[PDB]
Design a protein around this ligand. Structure first.
Ligand code: ZN
Ligand code: ZN
Ligand code: ZN
Length: 178
């Protein structure tokens, strides 16, 4: 097993996957690492199994169809994984916790959003469709773009949104386009 957390790349109190060499801090894994269960399989392994059980799940999909899916167990898992993929980028630190807004010449967003709030929402099963989760994710970056205007700090929102969107297309097998 790896000697660092797959998500935050630090050592500490780690839980090891039994089916692959990844390791996790308790609350870096999503969902939080389960109390018992021997053997234990991580989210990367659980996502791989879905694909292996239904190879055709990797054929291309339209985003509009994906968004309307109900949050059944397999779509819940895919959203948890997509969330985890964003936390895997160190630039996710800027979007993790509750923001505040007091900048000359800007007003804060009408509906603030941050990664830990989406994490809790997923944990508490507050999304009924994929669209709910993806809307809150995109809102994080859109709020940041609007607030920071022409400050070059806006680019952090662009950068982390690109990680989100690449992973969204991969995890949900969105049809490749030009
Ligand atoms: Zn970690
Ligand atoms: Zn694993
Ligand atoms: Zn099948």
């Amino acid at each position: 097993n790896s000697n660092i957390c797959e998500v935050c790349n630090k050592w500490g109190r780690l839980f090891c996957c039994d089916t692959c060499p990844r390791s996790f801090h308790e609350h870096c894994h999503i969902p939080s690492v389960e109390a018992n269960k021997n053997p234990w399989s991580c989210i990367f392994c659980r996502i791989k199994t879905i694909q292996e059980r239904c190879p055709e799940s990797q054929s291309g999909h339209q985003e509009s169809e994906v968004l309307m899916r109900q949050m059944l167990p397999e779509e819940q898992l895919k959203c948890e994984f997509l969330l985890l993929k964003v936390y895997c980028d160190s630039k996710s630190c800027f979007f993790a916790s509750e923001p505040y807004y007091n900048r000359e010449g800007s007003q804060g967003p009408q509906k603030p959003m941050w990664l830990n709030k989406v994490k809790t929402s997923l944990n508490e099963q507050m999304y009924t469709r994929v669209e709910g989760f993806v809307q809150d994710m995109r809102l994080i970056f859109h709020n940041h773009k609007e607030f920071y205007r022409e400050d070059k700090f806006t680019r952090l929102g662009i950068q982390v949104q690109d990680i989100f969107e690449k992973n969204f297309r991969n995890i949900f097998a969105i049809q490749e386009t030009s």
